[PDB]
Design a protein around this ligand. Structure first.
Ligand code: HEM
Ligand code: HEM
Ligand code: HEM
Ligand code: HEM
Lengths: 141, 146, 141, 146
């Protein structure tokens, strides 16, 4: 559960992402695919090569979903229900995977926003991502 | 853990550029801030009341050095991590009873710290190599639990 | 995140516990202490012997908090704020310990309410206990 | 896993009452219902749409019997779980890539099933003995990860 401070931190940092959103999203996926190769299993029909346009496109989708979550922070389940359906009901993604992507996103943010990635913001971002993961792995409809 | 020659090179090269006096404290400090239940193990360290307090604690910075020293030890003996961490496993498992998931968290925060420090140089393939190392270390520390 | 049917299942099951809530929380604690001895570390000042009156009184407390949580299912963060403060801020309980207690509670319920402990109710209580656990392990005030 | 003689007696006595044709099916079904992502591994089993469909699946029950059998095997070889489960570890880890936390969940649901069927008899001390066994089996299965 996020503190008001958490929400503020998240809005501030995610805000600084801006139009890089998608790039950051694609980099996080590539980091995931290389570091934890088992995750590729969920993308049987993707071109997971290095400058893959498929991954770039997907990265943008992921990044947009996070922007959506930020702009509905106080009522995530309602805003992300379609994503829960996909991830939880249709794909049946093992929750462990969410920890891997969350980690890869944190790594990406650290590598790009050195001044913003303070311990306090790192803490809020981790908590936020765990919140999002919980929604996407639950069947609540 | 087995790193291809290419991976070991990449790991090795970056590690020589790590500020050994500071990176360990940053990593320990962030563990304490990000996963606050871990503070319960460092009560004798003093004031861990605020992120600011954690990060400026002399004991956290000093202890951080010791932790980093352990990682350097692993890097030099990827071959026998288990042998290498035997005494540390006993300390952490049977004397401190630290849940093993905590070992993985520290390994991941170190990775975050490296990324923060090196920027673009901490590439996806470099990270991949570092993940195998960090998992190997955590697995060696958790040995007594296995 | 709980579905509306989860909420119904918990309310119904918790209803059947009723009068024995107290005895059940005490048994759950006892099961945890025996099965996962590391958990005893949080209670150094407790008599953890079999019929310890301390555990019995503590079991009541635990059970009362769960009853409250069930009653405030749509509003847990608000309802449990004080307990979150204690467990997350003051005691700094490692989150793994909440999974151990949750499991011991399910075992106690299965043992005492076999007819009610259907697959669906089991599933609903598990999610409920995970939700309680999340609240108690996060600092959000 | 070391069981005190009293613990071994307790374990054995309850295990002698288990309905071998039903319990593993109950356990496997409950895993699929309680932790639904696990269904991904059993898509070939057919209809797993609802609790009733899962619990009534013939493939679930048949498979469950195999699982129980592995538990019986472990009970007789507590001294050498890693050797006994070597082949099963390779299958689950190397071939299926089942995350090790899942091994822990199945053992716990098995415990919940025992508590369900044996109520009164499943006392705290009996559960404690069974928790050691199930942790033992889970660790042996995850050995390839270690
Ligand atoms: C922060 C967590 C995540 C977010 C916000 C997220 C977001 C998304 C979005 C927005 C989509 C596309 C839906 C559409 O078509 O509009 C998607 C699809 C998908 N996601 Fe995720 N995702 C997350 C985690 C994961 C993880 C951890 C995995 C598995 C390792 C995963 C596997 C997939 C797959 C396989 C697809 C479908 C791709 C296709 O077939 O086109 N997701 N996700
Ligand atoms: C990859 C993970 C870790 C490594 C490599 C590591 C390394 C070390 C080292 C080298 C020491 C000092 C031993 C000595 O005095 O020579 C130590 C002590 C200690 N570690 Fe860790 N550690 C790790 C994870 C953890 C975690 C996750 C926790 C708790 C959350 C923890 C808690 C402690 C404590 C409380 C001590 C203090 C004992 C003392 O010096 O009196 N460690 N660790
Ligand atoms: C289902 C989750 C849990 C609930 C609902 C719960 C509930 C409670 C309640 C109601 C109290 C007493 C509050 C008061 O009146 O002051 C309490 C105290 C406490 N709890 Fe929990 N608890 C849970 C999990 C845990 C876990 C997993 C642990 C550690 C293994 C733990 C350790 C403690 C300790 C050490 C105290 C204070 C005891 C004392 O010093 O008197 N709790 N808890
Ligand atoms: C205590 C833990 C477990 C035990 C003792 C166990 C035991 C077994 C056994 C005896 C088999 C049959 C092997 C054969 O074909 O001869 C099997 C197969 C299988 N297990 Fe497990 N299992 C465990 C946990 C799990 C979990 C948690 C999952 C997934 C969530 C899983 C997924 C599978 C699958 C998909 C197969 C099918 C292989 C096939 O039919 O080709 N197992 N397991």
């Amino acid at each position: 559960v996020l503190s008001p401070a958490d929400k503020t931190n998240v809005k501030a940092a995610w805000g600084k992402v801006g139009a890089h959103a998608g790039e950051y999203g694609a980099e996080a996926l590539e980091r995931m695919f290389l570091s934890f190769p088992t995750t590729k299993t969920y993308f049987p029909h993707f071109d997971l090569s290095h400058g893959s346009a498929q991954v770039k496109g997907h990265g943008k989708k992921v990044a947009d979903a996070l922007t959506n979550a930020v702009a509905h922070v106080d009522d995530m389940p309602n805003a992300l229900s379609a994503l829960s359906d996909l991830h939880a009901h249709k794909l049946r993604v093992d929750p462990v995977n969410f920890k891997l992507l969350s980690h890869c996103l944190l790594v990406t943010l650290a590598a790009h926003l050195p001044a913003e990635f303070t311990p306090a913001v790192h803490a809020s971002l981790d908590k936020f991502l765990a919140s999002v993961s919980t929604v996407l792995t639950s069947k609540y409809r | 853990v087995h790193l291809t020659p290419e991976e070991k090179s990449a790991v090795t090269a970056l590690w020589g550029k790590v500020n050994v006096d500071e990176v360990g404290g940053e990593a320990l400090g962030r563990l304490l801030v990000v996963y606050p239940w871990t503070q319960r193990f460092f009560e004798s360290f003093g004031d861990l009341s605020t992120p600011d307090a954690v990060m400026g604690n002399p004991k956290v910075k000093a202890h951080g050095k010791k932790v980093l020293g352990a990682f350097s030890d692993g890097l030099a003996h990827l071959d026998n991590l288990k042998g290498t961490f035997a005494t540390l496993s006993e300390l952490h498992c049977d004397k401190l009873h630290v849940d093993p998931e905590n070992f993985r968290l520290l390994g991941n925060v170190l990775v975050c710290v490296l990324a923060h420090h090196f920027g673009k140089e901490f590439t996806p393939p470099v990270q991949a190599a570092y993940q195998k190392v960090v998992a190997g270390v955590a697995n060696a520390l958790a040995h007594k639990y296995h």
